[PDB]
Design a protein around this ligand. Structure first.
Ligand SMILES: N[C@H]1CC[C@H](Nc2nccc(-c3cccnc3Oc3ccc(NS(=O)(=O)c4ccccc4)c4ccccc34)n2)CC1
Length: 337
């Protein structure tokens, strides 16, 4: 049963996988990820090694939620699992989980460093929004979208790699309502998409900062101090702190995103430029009550040329604390079924 597996050294770690997976190359560390050729499917795959994911509750809750959710969702813009396995034979010896998905070519950090035409940028954006809408329809509100957890192929197809934060580290993309602990709804994810869109245009992180204080300052000093209605939705403590900040009017969007940042040589590109700038202005809106929704962003002219009911309207529960040993059991049952 273990002769089904072989081991190879990859850097500082050891991968022990099914024999079907061949010629492993490292493509990411931080679990460990390898590219591989899969002889049964005749295609390339990415193999992720979770080492002792039950070693603490943070690793374990995340790993478990991820595994479970991969069955609560089938959609081309979201990560899909081809295979799950462990080389260990019994609950007692169990250590590692390996997860296999289709191999993609790049993450969004890499694409952000490139200039893109409007057709590519808009298609990428459309796919993000489709994936999010599918998620929201399943009751999953992500709240942690970022360029590092989105991946693309050379043909511009896109996938979201994880399922976000639970109902209960890079933070530049987190919504104001998250950063300020204020409660949220579906369009909390529009903010992050706006941060990503804005970065793709400017080639610079919009709201960089070593901590949330820093981040909040970078947000208001560019977008302006938000309205009184927004302030009055904050808790006494946080509202105090946010209202006693140096005030700002902020800048308009032609100044935040000058005409020289876009391709605007032809009439096609001049028009798409102003339309891009319009969508940004509906997305980077501090007050969730005034921020565009996902359905409305899909209907926007910059995005809607791609619209397709098939992709947009595809069909769609406890969260609790446990010890290490209980997590190890929960997780092992999920990889074994
Ligand atoms: N420079 C290029 C970047 C893209 C690379 N191709 C590629 N294709 C697919 C996935 C990845 C990838 C890269 C780095 C880290 N993770 C990657 O993929 C995964 C992310 C999350 C996964 N889910 S998870 O359960 O492991 C997870 C999610 C969130 C937190 C913890 C664990 C993956 C599961 C199986 C296989 C790959 C997974 N990378 C090729 C090289």
């Amino acid at each position: 049963v273990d002769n089904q597996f072989y081991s190879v050294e990859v850097g500082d770690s050891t991968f022990t996988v099914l024999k079907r997976y061949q010629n492993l190359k490292p493509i990411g560390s931080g679990g460990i990820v390898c590219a591989a050729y899969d002889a049964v499917l005749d295609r390339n795959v990415a193999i992720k090694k979770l080492s002792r994911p039950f070693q603490n509750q943070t690793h374990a809750k995340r790993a478990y939620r991820e595994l479970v959710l991969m069955k609560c969702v089938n959609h081309k813009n979201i990560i899909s699992l081809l295979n799950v396995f462990t080389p260990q034979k019994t609950l007692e010896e169990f250590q590692d989980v390996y997860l296999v998905m289709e191999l993609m070519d790049a993450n969004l950090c890499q694409v952000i460093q490139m200039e893109l035409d409007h057709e590519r940028m808009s298609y990428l954006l459309y796919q993000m929004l489709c994936g999010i809408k599918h998620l929201h329809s399943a009751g999953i509100i992500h709240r942690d979208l970022k360029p590092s957890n989105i991946v693309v192929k050379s043909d511009c197809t896109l996938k979201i790699l994880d399922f976000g934060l639970a109902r209960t580290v890079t933070r530049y993309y987190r919504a104001p309502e998250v950063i300020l602990g204020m409660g949220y709804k579906e369009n909390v994810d529009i903010w992050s998409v706006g941060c990503i869109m804005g970065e793709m245009v400017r080639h610079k992180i919009l709201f960089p900062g070593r901590d949330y204080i820093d981040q909040w300052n970078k947000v208001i000093e560019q977008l302006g101090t938000p309205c009184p209605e927004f302030m009055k939705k904050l808790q006494p403590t946080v509202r105090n702190y946010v209202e006693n900040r140096p005030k700002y009017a902020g800048l308009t969007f032609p100044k935040l995103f000058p005409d020289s940042l876009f391709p605007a040589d032809s009439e096609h590109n001049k028009l798409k430029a102003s339309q891009a700038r319009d969508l940004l202005s509906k997305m980077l809106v501090i007050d969730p009550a005034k921020r565009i929704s996902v359905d409305d962003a899909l209907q926007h002219p910059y995005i809607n040329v791609w619209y397709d009911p098939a992709e947009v309207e595809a069909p769609p529960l406890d969260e609790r604390e446990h010890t290490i040993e209980e997590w190890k059991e929960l997780i092992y049952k999920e990889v074994m079924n």
